[PDB]
């Protein structure tokens, strides 16, 4: 071409090549994110013919119109039921970034492998084919302004891209996060019908004559014999309810009222979280009993306690028709106790009737009595007596015994310190020439952790008659000053241990109802070991060394009167481990030895091999492994010994949810995709191996996928499979992590074991990222967590995660550098270790483009600063090209003009009903063009290009840091680099000795995908508690 027109021809060829790369990349996969698209574009080698250095985000952001038009044209020709190629999250993000209007021109080309099948076992296939019956049961119009919508005649060529995008946004968003949605009320609370029976009479004599109006019988006749233990169906008043079935636990004649009987209600599976997926003939036990008259007795029903087989461990894989014998399913049956408050499935309670109450015992009555007595705060032992108060030595509450001398948790409002404690600018109008985007800036906080005290005495105030009042109990408490609460204030806690406490002499008086838990507070010198071991020895352990004087604001020595099994580790199979975060957390818990692992991704398997020398990793897809195990082989293709029946004890994993990531109601295509996904394969693994403990981890939206259908189906499979199941949501940042990432956790325990409780929160976190509740079938479900936005330890921030790392600049690739400094906080002290002369590893960051480097060099260091503070200053870049100043060529009505009268619009799109003007777009500018082009529609893109806050936290997991991504801020708080691989690993809580593998991007992905080990350790501790209890039972 001509030299004058050479740049334009080169730009056109660049457009062709970027469109071709984008279209083939989208052919390769349909689940990539915007960062993946940017990496694929950058890694592409420019052609020999075209004189282009390398494609960067500026090239994509300037050719967005053409590439998006070409991609829409690709899928606009051949239309199928599959999702259109331009609804991919990467490309949706790209459209949202650059102001591209969809549905114009197109069709400019001028006339231009298998569904697979998961190796599900007989049982899981039975469940899914059973649910296959009900999946067939079966606002936001076209925009009308875009060309395709304006074209005359839904049609495959008339699928409104804007409508599809809004539908996809609804699919990704949670519809809807209404907090209320009131908590479910008690079930069967309505009235029941009265039945007209012919004759009812007792048989025999009064079995038990209590001496009151109640005379207890055993056998009744209502045209049919009824004894104690027989089940009765009752028809209630018609309120869209099925017939209730209740076990008659006691029947008696009342001298005052009519003929009585106590019924312990069953509960049908349809009334639980199981919903329609439950077997109609299956029932569950509940804590719902009530005494009625036998006048409402409708009929007699027969139920069977389908107890698990004595050889339940080896029953997996067997055909259920072989075990179907016999007479099933014909009558009602129950196998699992159900708690609806926490959505917990357990084995039936083993409470045993007493001889005196043998013919009256109701398990619901006994459980309710135990729960009511346990919750009541009562005092135990009297010590000494005064004229106004009486002194005790111990007290009990919620199954916890507090004596004198144990550390006590108190709510933050219980008492205040005697120190003054909390003791209480504006720049000039910035140069709109030099800061032309400051106007877009403008025009809950994490609560304090638990107060900790030490009991000095327990006392009760004497009543008017002089008797002690056991309804209320008062506690006198010596306060403990945290370093945060000291006169040094917040900067004192940067280097202080997360455990450190200061002894005081001020005393407080609190009500025993305010007590929230027992913690062990102890001296440091009287410790029989190093303070580190005691801190790691057990939960809620605090140590104090020097006392604090508030009036003198000084530190002194504490006064003298302030001084005072291992089970075998379960063999573990870890499916889809990745780099092994969950396995490392369980190892830190000391409960699991991971003897196998499955991972298709090669770098993750290499990392697992490096971190776990004594483990075997099968780098083949799990379906092949399971099929080989079923067929009976002992060695795979490479000769690695597959585990067999009984080898697996704990099965843990998290399967990817790419196939069923939508949140609309199920569709035959989506359900067919689900039926052979990886989660069904993992459930088949649990069915075959029958592990003692079963753990499913996933993202939060796993709970509410397809209107909770994935969760309901998984729970149904677990229940049918004979397990004890529970589910919940855990916020990672509450367990020693400086990151907000909510995770859905499904726990299952084998019959004869104890179902683990969810771990209690440790570090207090901001309430905006602690919504752990769940909405299923218009019902609100909560985990068994009792700590609500409070905890013993303070929050963990970025300053405690990445402060001590030596400064490195952009593009650093030195794998092995020196630490060059002692750790400055508790988190980094714990992560580094005890031995101190290592070499810091993998402290590398991505080498961004020159334009991005200049932009993120010019971002100020003030907290919360983002692109809106970028100065429009002509700046030389590293490569030698020119970053021209961004020009304003239009006026926007919605925001007005500047104080200096300068224009604020960037494109003709600011005016309502005006299409974006071509050739008005600018590129290679310090302030990006797209951000002011489309700020108004996306809340000014707040947080884009921003820096981390030294007191804040990561927005989410950072799989691949990019300034223009949806993973929140990724710029380092002080230096001009993105967060490094080691910084990302420190965010997840990985030990500094943990080894990664691959190039920088693979290391970033490994760090991002893995579960934070501090979260896994907290869960691992809870599992160990049930390991103890089952072993403790043996006597």
């Amino acid at each position: 071409p001509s030299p004058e027109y050479a740049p334009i021809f080169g730009l056109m060829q660049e457009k062709i090549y970027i469109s071709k790369i984008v279209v083939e990349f989208l052919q390769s996969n349909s689940d990539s994110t915007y960062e993946d698209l940017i990496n694929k574009i950058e890694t592409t080698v420019p052609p020999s013919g075209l004189n282009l250095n390398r494609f960067t985000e500026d090239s994509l952001l300037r050719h967005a119109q053409f590439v998006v038009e070409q991609v829409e044209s690709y899928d606009e020709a051949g239309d199928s039921d599959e999702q259109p190629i331009f609804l991919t999250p990467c490309m949706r993000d790209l459209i949202k970034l650059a102001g591209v209007t969809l549905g114009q021109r197109r069709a400019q080309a001028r006339r231009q492998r298998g569904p697979t099948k998961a190796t599900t076992t007989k049982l899981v296939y039975q469940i899914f084919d059973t649910f296959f019956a009900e999946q067939i049961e079966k606002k936001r119009r076209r925009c009308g302004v875009c060309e395709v919508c304006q074209q005359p005649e839904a049609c495959q060529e008339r699928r409104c891209p804007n409508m599809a995008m809004k539908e996809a946004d609804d699919d990704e968003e949670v519809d809807d996060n209404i907090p209320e949605m009131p908590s479910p009320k008690k079930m069967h609370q309505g009235k029941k019908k009265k039945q007209n029976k012919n004759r009812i009479s007792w048989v025999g004599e009064a079995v038990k004559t209590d001496g009151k109006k109640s005379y207890y019988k055993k056998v009744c006749i209502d045209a049919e014999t009824l004894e104690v233990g027989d089940c009765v169906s009752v028809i209630p008043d018609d309120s869209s309810k099925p017939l209730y079935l209740a076990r008659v636990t006691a029947l008696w004649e009342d001298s005052s009222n009519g003929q009585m009987f106590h019924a312990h209600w069953f509960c049908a599976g349809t009334d639980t979280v199981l919903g329609a997926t439950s077997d109609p003939l299956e029932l569950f036990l509940v804590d719902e009993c009530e005494d009625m008259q036998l006048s409402y007795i409708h009929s007699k029903v027969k139920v069977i306690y389908k107890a698990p087989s004595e050889n339940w461990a080896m029953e997996g894989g067997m055909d259920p028709e072989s075990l179907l014998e016999g007479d099933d399913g014909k009558t009602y049956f129950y196998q699992l106790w159900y708690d609806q408050d926490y959505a917990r499935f357990e084995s039936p309670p083993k409470t045993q009737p007493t001889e005196d109450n043998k013919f009256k015992f109701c398990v619901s009555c006994a459980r309710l009595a135990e729960m009511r007595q346990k919750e009541i705060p009562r005092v135990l032992e009297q010590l000494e007596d005064l004229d106004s108060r009486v002194l005790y030595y111990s007290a009990t509450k919620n199954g916890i015994l507090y004596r004198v001398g144990d550390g006590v948790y108190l709510p933050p409002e219980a008492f205040t310190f005697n120190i003054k404690l909390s003791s209480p600018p504006r720049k000039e109008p910035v140069d709109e020439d030099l800061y032309p985007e400051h106007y877009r800036k403008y025009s809950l906080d994490a609560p304090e952790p638990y107060r900790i005290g030490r009991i000095k005495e327990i006392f009760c105030p004497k009543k008017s008659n002089g008797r002690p009042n056991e309804t209320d109990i008062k506690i006198r408490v010596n306060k403990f000053y945290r370093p945060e609460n000291t006169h040094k204030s917040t900067p004192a806690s940067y280097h202080a241990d997360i455990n450190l406490l200061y002894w005081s002499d001020e005393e407080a008086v609190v009500d025993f109802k305010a007590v929230q838990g027992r913690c062990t507070v102890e001296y440091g010198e009287d410790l029989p070991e190093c303070v580190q071991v005691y801190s790691m020895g057990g939960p809620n352990r605090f140590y104090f060394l020097e006392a604090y004087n508030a009036k003198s604001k000084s530190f002194e020595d504490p006064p003298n009167h302030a001084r005072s099994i291992k089970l075998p580790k379960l063999r573990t199979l870890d499916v889809f481990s990745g780099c092994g975060g969950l396995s490392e957390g369980f190892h830190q818990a000391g409960i699991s030895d991971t003897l196998w692992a499955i991972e298709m991704w090669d770098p993750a398997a290499q990392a697992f091999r490096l971190n776990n020398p004594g483990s075997t990793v099968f780098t083949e897809d799990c379906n092949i492994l399971l099929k080989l195990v079923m067929a009976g082989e002992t060695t795979n293709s490479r000769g690695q010994r597959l585990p067999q029946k009984g080898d697996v004890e704990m099965l843990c994993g998290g399967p990817p949810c790419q196939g069923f990531s939508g949140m609309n109601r199920f569709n035959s295509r989506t359900y067919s995709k689900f039926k052979n996904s990886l989660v069904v394969s993992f459930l088949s693994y649990c069915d075959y191996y029958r592990p003692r403990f079963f753990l499913l981890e996933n993202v939060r939206n796993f709970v509410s996928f397809k209107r909770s259908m994935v969760l309901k189906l998984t729970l149904r499979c677990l229940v049918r499979m004979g397990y004890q199941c529970t589910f919940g949501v855990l916020q990672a940042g509450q367990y020693g992590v400086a990151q907000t990432r909510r995770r859905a956790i499904i726990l299952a325990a084998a019959p004869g074991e104890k179902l683990p409780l969810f771990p209690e929160p440790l570090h207090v976190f901001a309430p905006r990222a602690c919504q752990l509740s769940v909405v299923v079938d218009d019902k609100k479900f909560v985990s068994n967590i009792t700590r609500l936005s409070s905890g013993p330890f303070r929050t963990i921030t970025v300053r405690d995660t990445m402060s001590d790392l030596p400064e490195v600049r952009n593009g650093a690739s030195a794998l092995e550098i020196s630490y060059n400094g002692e750790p400055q906080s508790w988190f980094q002290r714990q992560l580094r270790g005890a031995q101190y002369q290592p070499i810091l590893r993998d402290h590398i960051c991505k080498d961004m483009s020159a334009l991005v480097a200049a932009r993120m060099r010019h971002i100020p260091l003030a907290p919360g600063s983002d692109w809106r503070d970028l100065p429009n200053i002509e700046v030389r870049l590293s490569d030698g090209t020119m970053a021209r100043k961004l020009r304003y060529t239009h006026h926007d009505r919605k925001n007005g003009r500047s104080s200096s009268g300068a224009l604020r619009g960037v494109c003709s799109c600011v005016e309502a009903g005006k299409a974006c003007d071509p050739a008005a777009r600018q590129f290679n500018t310090l302030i990006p063009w797209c951000l002011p082009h489309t700020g108004n529609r996306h809340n000014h893109w707040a947080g884009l290009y921003g820096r981390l806050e030294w007191d804040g936290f990561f927005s989410t997991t950072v799989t691949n840091p990019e300034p223009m991504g949806k993973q929140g801020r990724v710029l380092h708080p002080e230096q001009h680099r993105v967060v490094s691989v080691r910084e990302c690993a420190r965010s997840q809580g990985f030990p500094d000795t943990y080894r990664l593998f691959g190039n920088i991007l693979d290391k970033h992905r490994q760090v991002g995908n893995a579960v934070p080990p501090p979260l896994a350790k907290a869960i691992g501790l809870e599992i160990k508690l049930c390991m103890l209890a089952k072993a403790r039972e043996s006597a």
């Binding site: 940067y494 280097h495 202080a496 010198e525 190093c530 020097e546 020595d557 003298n560 001084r563 600049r809 952009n810 593009g811 650093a812 690739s813 030195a814 630490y819 060059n820 400094g821 002692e822 400055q824 005890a834 031995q835 101190y836 002369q837 080498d847 060099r857 590293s878 030698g880």
Partner: protein, 524 residues
């Protein structure tokens, strides 16, 4: 029969005088009397043997087996000579060796007068030990032991302690029990018997006493409690200079409860320097050597710095003296570059300019750091080299934050050679020269800048090359000379004498993109 013997170490009461620490004596600061004795020998035989060997009557000495307690203390214990007299020592020690015994005798100057060893009732008597603390000299004085009934009241012992310690009688005394290191418990009530007054009363407990006197508030340790506190946290640290190889260092006594400022002040005093001109290094902990450097703001104590030493191991701490204040030293940027010397040899150097300074400051540091030519220019320059090709010269006004952080970028500092300092601009031209074997991609060797005249006898350039290199005069011959531009290279015949600047400058007005360069071919 060496496995049948044991070492029995006798310590006398004269060894108790002068001890300034906890319990009775310092295990290191004590002279024993060692006995090699058969395990099957009876204790009575040993009591006879000691009494005869050391020159005492057997009924004038008492044996108090040195027994370790749960709290970590080591105190004298009770042994019954009569009842237990026929049992072997190896069963009495419970598999302990060496075996220390306190020998309680009558003072020979009070024994020559006829006094004998008092009787001791195990149920109703107790052995109390008395120490006197003097705040003015801040020291302990051993005041012997006493027999006393358990039920006796402290007030009846006050006259005894007074006249036993040399105090004027009826002097008000403050009493403490030294239960263990870091545990000194004041006795609040003197009107109660010893049983009630002293928790867990055993033989060998020690009560420390001092005058009750207002002058104590002028002392920095008014009471024995604070004395034992300061003693509990005192520790001797060996400071060593990291520059001196195998420097034995000097020992300073400090308190564990000390921050960075106080330690630095102390060391600076014992070193006659400003505290700010010192940087400290914690030990690597298991090995002996300098570890992680310590920042100036470190908010810790001495125990954190010494925590990975065993109590037996010597606790060492490294340091170095600075020529500049520690804050500016912590804000220095490590800049690794290559220094070219007079001999045309590369040296690795690391400089620490201020992170915000300019290239000028770097060159000034190197000038303060180096020596210049015999009588050359004395002016240095900074080249930036990639792929053994000079990709730029950095002007001394360039910002240090503006320099290529990439590892392929190598910064060289060099003295301009005499025939390159001031050259003739419209005739002589500096050309970039590099080596390569076979093809031009695999470059190697030391690249260089070469002067070229105008219309100059290309074999003049080859005798200049020969004059620079200076290998034997044949091996020069295999050099293949080529002109390389954007990857293309045309080889040039040495004896043809083809030279002029135009075939070395890029197109008119061109700088930004690569300039023609000279290529040499031979094998390495």
């Amino acid at each position: 029969e060496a496995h049948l013997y044991m070492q029995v170490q006798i310590v006398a009461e004269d060894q108790f005088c002068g001890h300034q620490g906890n319990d009775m004596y310092d295990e290191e600061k004590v002279k024993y009397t060692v006995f090699k004795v058969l395990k099957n020998s009876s204790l009575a035989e040993f009591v006879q043997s000691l009494s005869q060997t050391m020159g005492f009557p057997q009924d004038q000495i008492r044996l108090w087996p040195m027994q370790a307690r749960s709290n970590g203390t080591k105190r004298p214990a009770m042994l019954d000579n009569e009842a237990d007299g026929n049992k072997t020592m190896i069963e009495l020690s419970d598999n302990e060796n060496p075996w220390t015994i306190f020998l309680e005798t009558v003072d020979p100057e009070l024994a020559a007068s006829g006094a004998t060893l008092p009787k001791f009732d195990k149920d109703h008597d107790v052995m109390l030990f008395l120490k006197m603390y003097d705040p003015k000299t801040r020291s302990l004085n051993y005041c012997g032991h006493i027999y006393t009934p358990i039920s006796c009241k402290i007030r009846d012992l006050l006259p005894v302690m007074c006249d036993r310690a040399g105090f004027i009688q009826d002097t008000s005394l403050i009493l403490y029990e030294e239960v263990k290191p870091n545990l000194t418990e004041r006795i609040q009530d003197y009107d109660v018997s010893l049983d009630k007054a002293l928790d867990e009363l055993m033989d060998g407990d020690i009560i420390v006493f001092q005058k009750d006197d207002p002058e104590n508030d002028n002392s920095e340790l008014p009471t024995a409690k604070e004395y034992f506190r300061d003693l509990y946290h005192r520790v001797d640290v060996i400071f060593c200079d990291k520059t001196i190889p195998n420097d034995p260092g000097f020992v300073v006594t400090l308190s564990n409860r000390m921050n960075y400022f106080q330690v630095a002040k102390t060391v600076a005093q014992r070193l006659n320097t400003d505290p700010m001109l010192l940087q400290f290094f914690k030990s690597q902990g298991y090995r002996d050597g300098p570890g992680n450097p310590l920042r100036h703001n470190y908010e810790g104590t001495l125990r954190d710095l010494l925590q990975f030493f065993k109590p037996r191991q010597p606790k060492k701490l490294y340091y170095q003296q600075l020529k500049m204040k520690i804050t500016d030293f912590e804000n220095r940027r490590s800049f690794k570059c290559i220094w070219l010397n007079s001999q045309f040899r590369e040296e690795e150097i690391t400089l620490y300019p201020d992170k915000h300074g300019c290239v000028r400051d770097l060159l000034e540091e190197c000038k303060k750091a180096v020596e210049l030519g015999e009588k050359a220019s004395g002016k240095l320059r900074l080249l930036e080299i990639v792929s053994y090709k000079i990709i730029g010269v950095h002007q001394e006004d360039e910002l240090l934050e503006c320099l290529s952080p990439a590892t392929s970028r190598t910064f060289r500092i060099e003295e301009i050679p005499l025939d390159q300092v001031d050259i003739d601009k419209e005739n002589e031209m500096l050309v970039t020269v590099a080596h390569f074997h076979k093809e031009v991609f695999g470059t190697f060797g030391i690249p260089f800048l070469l002067r070229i005249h105008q219309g100059e006898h290309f074999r003049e350039v080859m005798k200049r090359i020969q004059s620079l290199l200076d290998i034997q005069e044949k091996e020069f011959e295999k050099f293949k000379f080529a002109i390389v531009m954007m990857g293309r290279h045309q080889y040039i015949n040495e004896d043809e004498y083809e030279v002029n600047l135009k075939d070395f400058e890029p197109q008119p007005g061109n700088m930004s993109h690569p300039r023609p360069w000279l290529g040499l071919d031979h094998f390495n």
